[PDB]
Design an enzyme around this catalytic site. Sequence first.
Site, PDB file in Angstrom:
ATOM      1  N   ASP A 144     -10.569  -6.449  -1.245  1.00  0.00           N
ATOM      2  CA  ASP A 144     -11.224  -6.347   0.066  1.00  0.00           C
ATOM      3  C   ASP A 144     -12.028  -7.606   0.405  1.00  0.00           C
ATOM      4  O   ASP A 144     -13.163  -7.780  -0.042  1.00  0.00           O
ATOM      5  CB  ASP A 144     -12.091  -5.078   0.127  1.00  0.00           C
ATOM      6  CG  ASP A 144     -12.350  -4.588   1.556  1.00  0.00           C
ATOM      7  OD1 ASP A 144     -11.796  -5.156   2.524  1.00  0.00           O
ATOM      8  OD2 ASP A 144     -13.118  -3.613   1.710  1.00  0.00           O
ATOM      9  N   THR A 172      -9.843  -7.882   6.865  1.00  0.00           N
ATOM     10  CA  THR A 172     -10.969  -8.800   6.635  1.00  0.00           C
ATOM     11  C   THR A 172     -10.541 -10.139   6.062  1.00  0.00           C
ATOM     12  O   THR A 172     -11.094 -11.173   6.436  1.00  0.00           O
ATOM     13  CB  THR A 172     -12.026  -8.212   5.685  1.00  0.00           C
ATOM     14  OG1 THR A 172     -11.447  -8.014   4.390  1.00  0.00           O
ATOM     15  CG2 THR A 172     -12.555  -6.899   6.219  1.00  0.00           C
ATOM     16  N   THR A 173      -9.568 -10.113   5.153  1.00  0.00           N
ATOM     17  CA  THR A 173      -9.055 -11.332   4.535  1.00  0.00           C
ATOM     18  C   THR A 173      -8.233 -12.162   5.527  1.00  0.00           C
ATOM     19  O   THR A 173      -8.363 -13.388   5.567  1.00  0.00           O
ATOM     20  CB  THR A 173      -8.215 -11.022   3.282  1.00  0.00           C
ATOM     21  OG1 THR A 173      -8.834  -9.968   2.535  1.00  0.00           O
ATOM     22  CG2 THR A 173      -8.089 -12.254   2.405  1.00  0.00           C
ATOM     23  N   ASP A 194     -11.172   1.142   3.170  1.00  0.00           N
ATOM     24  CA  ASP A 194     -10.282   0.296   3.959  1.00  0.00           C
ATOM     25  C   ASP A 194      -9.098   1.089   4.516  1.00  0.00           C
ATOM     26  O   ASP A 194      -8.711   0.888   5.667  1.00  0.00           O
ATOM     27  CB  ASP A 194      -9.801  -0.924   3.145  1.00  0.00           C
ATOM     28  CG  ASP A 194     -10.704  -2.160   3.329  1.00  0.00           C
ATOM     29  OD1 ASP A 194     -11.953  -2.031   3.288  1.00  0.00           O
ATOM     30  OD2 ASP A 194     -10.155  -3.271   3.512  1.00  0.00           O
TER      31      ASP A 194
HETATM   32  N1  ADP Z   1       4.652  -3.570   2.085  1.00  0.00           N
HETATM   33  C1  ADP Z   1       4.369  -4.641   2.870  1.00  0.00           C
HETATM   34  N2  ADP Z   1       5.364  -5.477   3.258  1.00  0.00           N
HETATM   35  C2  ADP Z   1       5.118  -6.551   4.038  1.00  0.00           C
HETATM   36  N3  ADP Z   1       3.890  -6.879   4.489  1.00  0.00           N
HETATM   37  C3  ADP Z   1       2.797  -6.130   4.180  1.00  0.00           C
HETATM   38  C4  ADP Z   1       2.978  -4.939   3.330  1.00  0.00           C
HETATM   39  N4  ADP Z   1       1.752  -4.395   3.183  1.00  0.00           N
HETATM   40  C5  ADP Z   1       0.870  -5.165   3.874  1.00  0.00           C
HETATM   41  N5  ADP Z   1       1.490  -6.203   4.472  1.00  0.00           N
HETATM   42  C6  ADP Z   1       0.862  -7.263   5.317  1.00  0.00           C
HETATM   43  O1  ADP Z   1      -0.240  -7.872   4.642  1.00  0.00           O
HETATM   44  C7  ADP Z   1      -1.453  -7.718   5.376  1.00  0.00           C
HETATM   45  C8  ADP Z   1      -2.482  -7.007   4.504  1.00  0.00           C
HETATM   46  O2  ADP Z   1      -3.500  -7.936   4.134  1.00  0.00           O
HETATM   47  P1  ADP Z   1      -4.430  -7.691   2.843  1.00  0.00           P
HETATM   48  O3  ADP Z   1      -4.006  -8.687   1.794  1.00  0.00           O
HETATM   49  O4  ADP Z   1      -4.453  -6.214   2.519  1.00  0.00           O
HETATM   50  O5  ADP Z   1      -5.897  -8.118   3.349  1.00  0.00           O
HETATM   51  P2  ADP Z   1      -6.439  -7.785   4.829  1.00  0.00           P
HETATM   52  O6  ADP Z   1      -5.791  -6.482   5.229  1.00  0.00           O
HETATM   53  O7  ADP Z   1      -7.929  -7.685   4.619  1.00  0.00           O
HETATM   54  O8  ADP Z   1      -6.007  -8.971   5.651  1.00  0.00           O
HETATM   55  C9  ADP Z   1      -1.143  -6.935   6.640  1.00  0.00           C
HETATM   56  O9  ADP Z   1      -1.501  -7.710   7.785  1.00  0.00           O
HETATM   57  C10 ADP Z   1       0.351  -6.687   6.633  1.00  0.00           C
HETATM   58  O10 ADP Z   1       0.977  -7.355   7.735  1.00  0.00           O
HETATM   59  F1  BEF Z   2      -7.879  -7.449   1.843  1.00  0.00           F
HETATM   60 BE1  BEF Z   2      -8.068  -6.234   3.115  1.00  0.00          BE
HETATM   61  F2  BEF Z   2      -9.628  -5.971   3.908  1.00  0.00           F
HETATM   62  F3  BEF Z   2      -6.786  -5.047   3.350  1.00  0.00           F
END
Ligand code: ADP
Ligand code: BEF
Lengths: 99, 77, 192, 539
Positions: free
Chosen positions: D63, D96-97, D396
């Site tokens: 997160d 957030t990231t 989250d």
């Molecule tokens: N199974 C998946 N396949 C492809 N893209 C994904 C998948 N799960 C999440 N994502 C992508 O990655 C991002 C998730 O970011 P994350 O690393 O959880 O940090 P944050 O949500 O805080 O930016 C989302 O914007 C989404 O587009």
């Molecule tokens: F790294 Be996150 F706020 F899904």
Amino acid sequence: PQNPNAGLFKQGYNSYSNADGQIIKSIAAIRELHQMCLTSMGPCGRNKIIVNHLGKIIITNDAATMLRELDIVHPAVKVLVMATEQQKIDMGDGTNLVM
Amino acid sequence: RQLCENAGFDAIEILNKLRLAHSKGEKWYGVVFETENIGDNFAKFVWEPALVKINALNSATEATNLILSVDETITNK
Amino acid sequence: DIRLVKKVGGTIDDTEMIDGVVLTQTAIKSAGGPTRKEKAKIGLIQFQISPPKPDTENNIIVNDYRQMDKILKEERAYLLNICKKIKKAKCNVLLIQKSILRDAVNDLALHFLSKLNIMVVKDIEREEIEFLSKGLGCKPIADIELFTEDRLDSADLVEEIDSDGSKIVRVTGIRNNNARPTVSVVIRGANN
Amino acid sequence: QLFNNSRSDTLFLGGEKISGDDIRNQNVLATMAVANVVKSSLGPVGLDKMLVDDIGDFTVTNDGATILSLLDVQHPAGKILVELAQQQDREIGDGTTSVVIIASELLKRANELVKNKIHPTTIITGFRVALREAIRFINEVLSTSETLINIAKTSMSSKIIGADSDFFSNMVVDALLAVKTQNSKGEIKYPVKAVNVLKAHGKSATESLLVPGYALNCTVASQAMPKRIAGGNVKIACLDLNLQKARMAMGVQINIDDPEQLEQIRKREAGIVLERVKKIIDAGAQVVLTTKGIDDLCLKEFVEAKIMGVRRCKKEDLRRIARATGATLVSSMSNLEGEETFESSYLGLCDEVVQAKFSDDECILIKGTSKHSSSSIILRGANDYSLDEMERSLHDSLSVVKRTLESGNVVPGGGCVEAALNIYLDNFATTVGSREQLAIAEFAAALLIIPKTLAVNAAKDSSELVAKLRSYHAASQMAKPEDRSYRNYGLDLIRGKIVDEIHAGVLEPTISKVKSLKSALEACVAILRIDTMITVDPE
Ligand SMILES: Nc1ncnc2c1ncn2[C@@H]1O[C@H](COP(=O)(O)OP(=O)(O)O)[C@@H](O)[C@H]1O
Ligand code: BEF
Ligand code: BEF
Ligand SMILES: [Mg+2]
Ligand SMILES: [Mg+2]
């Protein structure tokens, strides 16, 4: 609290027994310099820039040259280093495969 | 782009009007400092030997290709 | 007289001219849940709604056991009468000035105020009175024996929002003669 | 990058100033510093970090805002991106990231246009244009919707409970879908953290059992009280006032003049309480939950009456038990007349009040609420570091579900919202023209950072996927009305091939991408407007 001593015959040493400093702690200290020239083997291998004891820059693909230009402590690591220096004087090539 | 940025010209409006005019106006079109615009450097007399530009590029790459080869810097005390 | 209040979150986009008044504090909510009062009349209090003492050094000395249970009797009563005289003038919003003096608004008085569905807003700076008086067509009230339907407001809606997770107090629609005119502008922004 | 010299003309105190190019750069460097820490942590193929307190005490998380919260940031233009990172976690909950890494490349690229020659006012006007067009495009590429089980599961991957995503999927969805409430005469929102989350180190991760009621982290105050009360229609007294002996109200003093009154006055300090205790027992209360204290004096009254009664419980908890069982919180009970009475209709109806033993710790469960569904999640696992994060990973994931339920719109994530914006805006670049073109052009390509790093983090090659992804999105702009039949979008990273993320089930909420960019801009805008910094040393 407070702990006693084991034996005082010497002037102040360290002993790495039970093959520990050999069976585990040595293998992993070798692995540190094993991963080093692992990415220097062959045409796709990367050169390494080594700044020596006097500030003179040296860049090499060679394992033996790259290892000759480093200051090494670990005795069991030193063993394979003289071995890479062996095949340097005795064949020229293969220094990276020794390691 | 630097001869422009140094002299305070419009760096993008010269390169943009140079790239277009280098595909239709042939090789010798370069920066003519005397009017703040594009021009043929044969008639402008901007001349430099063969070796400069070939040794420039051959060295510039030797550097670039040497640095990318490096993956580890070790420095002793 | 131009009121510019800040609250972090969002974008400069979200800035708005409020058709009435913005307030700094929030509905107390310690007792009950009054927050969004519709078709409202606003009262404005200078005084303390507590079990108050006179400006002179005073102390209730106790002699008998039978004095005790009767002390709380009047205590409970005194606070209820004030809350009753408020509902009797017919207002559903309270605004109270700074209690740095002594009393404030009691937690016992607050449950009276809650179940009696009067929505309370405590701690309001003395500077804020001149503006709030004109902005809410509401004459300021110093003593209880001077709390009247006469000096109440008559605003259309009062409702505390939830913006970024952080509330603000809205007063939209104000009925009466605006002999004094007052604006209120809410500023939002992504970064402090 | 030679340390600059203080001017020989200007005279500023405990403060120096860096101007023009030196500052612009320092801002971008510090902005990348903040952003680059948390690029590794992006995507399903993304990983987690270990953050040492210095005492050795640590926290492991993904997160972004919590990682950024934790890093000690020293630069203004670093802390700005960190201030945005959290402004995210209070307006969307997830993403957030992402929002931080977008803002960084927007600055970085913006600067490399100024570090060319282009003026900052041109670029800042050129970012305004793109964003007006991107959000308009997002709303025209949103899908208004089963579906919640995806939106949950998309915020599962990239974090620890993504390996057991399906379980912690239907956990999240049902937990929230059971606290629906109306406010302000019609607002139907799902409360921002009404699902009380507890975490106890034991059992398996799968054995984390949802409560069909509420989880109180308190115990039956007296050990002689019943540690259970079961069967239909159980009566619960939600209290707020303490049940102890009072010091003479407030302004009250004692002058004993007739000795006989010593015991008279002293004994009556018990009565008032014992009388208020009686008015509670005799109301038909079987279980008492009091925010403030219970005296040993008033426990022996509950004990013998078999009333399971708690003390010192969080009022935050008690109000969500008030709204759920039927009960009303009792701050203090005084009638229309002065008299202190307590009517029986004040209490909440439930199914069971059972104190349940979890891994060396008992806590009270209010089972089966009557007045409205209530849900609580008790996590289980390896250790405290384990639990901590999967609570933050839930917060989250419960969040993204909330915003889906609050706003009737979802976006096909998986970096295809981003990838599509790249080429749409790049093609929009010609509509304006001039120098303002390179600006939007840099913006359009500054959105590449999401789909790029997602595939970097897989260790294998990026460009293979990255550029071949763009072609598929470049296959939607040359695609005819009927010939749609060419339109598709998305990205997969485990198998590593372009997939239909609506059919695959990859779903991020609508706002999660609007309030994502909206903020990201007003970040780099402020930083790009910076041309001189003046730092003044402490008092
Ligand atoms: N199974 C998946 N396949 C492809 N893209 C994904 C998948 N799960 C999440 N994502 C992508 O990655 C991002 C998730 O970011 P994350 O690393 O959880 O940090 P944050 O949500 O805080 O930016 C989302 O914007 C989404 O587009
Ligand atoms: F790294 Be996150 F706020 F899904
Ligand atoms: F490492 Be070798 F001798 F090419
Ligand atoms: Mg060789
Ligand atoms: Mg996520």
